[PDB]
């Protein structure tokens, strides 16, 4: 995406019920900070979740350590918190090369001034002034107003921790629910006229795969005829009727 938001200004979207290959980014390797939390990064294309919400924002290149489950900082206390046992993966890499220009990218900001801690997955957008004691301002920016949004500056000349990083937050949950987005599944081709194991969409067996003579009806997958002799299976790719012996 050519346009992002600040870490306090992050957006929440949701992708459900399709195919998403996540490990295809491995050999793509536009990475700096490949990391998952609490789950193995391999089998995300194998098994999958519901409530597969997604986030995206910009982070200055030094506070990347603060994205850690429970570990506080500029981000987890004041900008965006991920809880103890953050179900998800967070992978970061540089965005100086497009989401930064000369003179400083003074468009993204960060919240610093807030009384208390944040929530899991919290969008802490507000228009509130700070107070360290008991006496607030009268509107004009002074000694304890503390407009919490100080402008991030991203020049093409800064250090190594002073660069904008593209980073996403994979907001995941586990509620017993209909099954949304998973990885695309390895549809290896068929074989005919040989005793062979197979595994179709869930159900499986082992025998030969040959043609038929009889037709199906437009919602059929597999046919059993006498006492679950599941023999007449239409193939899921070519949508043509086959037989199992």
């Amino acid at each position, epitope marked *: 995406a050519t346009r992002f938001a600040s870490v306090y200004a992050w957006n929440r979207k949701r992708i459900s019920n399709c195919v998403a290959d996540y490990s295809v980014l491995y050999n793509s390797a536009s990475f700096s900070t490949f990391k998952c939390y609490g789950v193995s990064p391999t089998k995300l294309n194998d098994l999958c979740f519901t409530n597969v919400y997604a986030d995206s924002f910009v982070i200055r290149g030094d506070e990347v350590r603060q994205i850690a489950p429970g570990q506080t900082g500029k981000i987890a206390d004041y900008n965006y918190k991920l809880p103890d046992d953050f179900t998800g993966c967070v992978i970061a890499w540089n965005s100086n090369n497009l989401d930064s220009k000369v003179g400083g990218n003074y468009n993204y900001l960060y919240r610093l001034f807030r009384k208390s801690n944040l929530k899991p997955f919290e969008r802490d957008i507000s228009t509130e002034i700070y107070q360290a*004691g008991s*006496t607030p301002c009268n509107g004009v*920016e*002074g*000694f304890n107003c*503390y407009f919490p949004l100080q402008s991030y500056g991203f020049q093409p000349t800064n250090g190594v921790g002073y660069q904008p990083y593209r980073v996403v937050v994979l907001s995941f949950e586990l509620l017993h629910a209909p099954a949304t987005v998973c990885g695309p599944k390895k549809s290896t081709n068929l074989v005919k006229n040989k005793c062979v194991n197979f595994n179709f969409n869930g159900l499986t067996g082992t025998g030969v795969l040959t043609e038929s003579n009889k037709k199906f009806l437009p919602f059929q997958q597999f046919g059993r005829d006498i006492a679950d002799t599941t023999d007449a299976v239409r193939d899921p790719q070519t949508l043509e009727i086959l037989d199992i012996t």
Partner: antibody
Amino acid sequence: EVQLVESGGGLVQPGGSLRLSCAASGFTVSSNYMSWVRQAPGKGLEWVSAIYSGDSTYYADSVKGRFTISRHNPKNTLYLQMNSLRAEDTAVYYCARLVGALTNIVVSGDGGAFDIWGQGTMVTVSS
Amino acid sequence: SYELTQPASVSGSPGQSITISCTGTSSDVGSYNLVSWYQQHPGKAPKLMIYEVSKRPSGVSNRFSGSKSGNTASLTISGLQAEDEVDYYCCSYAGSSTWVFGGGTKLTVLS
């Protein structure tokens, strides 16, 4: 080298101008809160202006529109251009660094002090 | 033009207590914790003694202490010395990011 340098005052007609130069030392005005203090010698202290770190210029009542404050972030000098001079401007002009949380002596709370001081200048406004 | 209201002269004994007030308005003292007190030698600049009204600075002599009660503030001074007889002023956050200074308090040292 904590130092404030107020000078440049002299013979200015009522109806003219004079630009001071508070050479701030020991810190930078690019990241510290600043203010001016005017005072007839021995009389009461009288506040003038507040430019903040990052050039947000705030004034007092009488000097609102009259005095003109300016700085230079590498040069570290607090200037006081002065238009619409009155006969009550017989006063020694002290620049004084305002203490906020970006001032190095306050962690939490309120700040609000002047710790580093100078000598004052003698801007005489008389016919 | 725009100052803070004080009695111009108080007096006390060495080793005893005295309280110098700082009465302002409903926009400078009664809504901000920044009645700060300075130490001006006549002919010199002021000198930082009291700021952040209830808090005490680092290593500075404990003979000055400020307190704020509504609109009328105070400078609870304990233990006068010979080095307390200069021009004294209170400074307040005068609202809308403006500032204000005192009307002067000339502490006359006895004995």
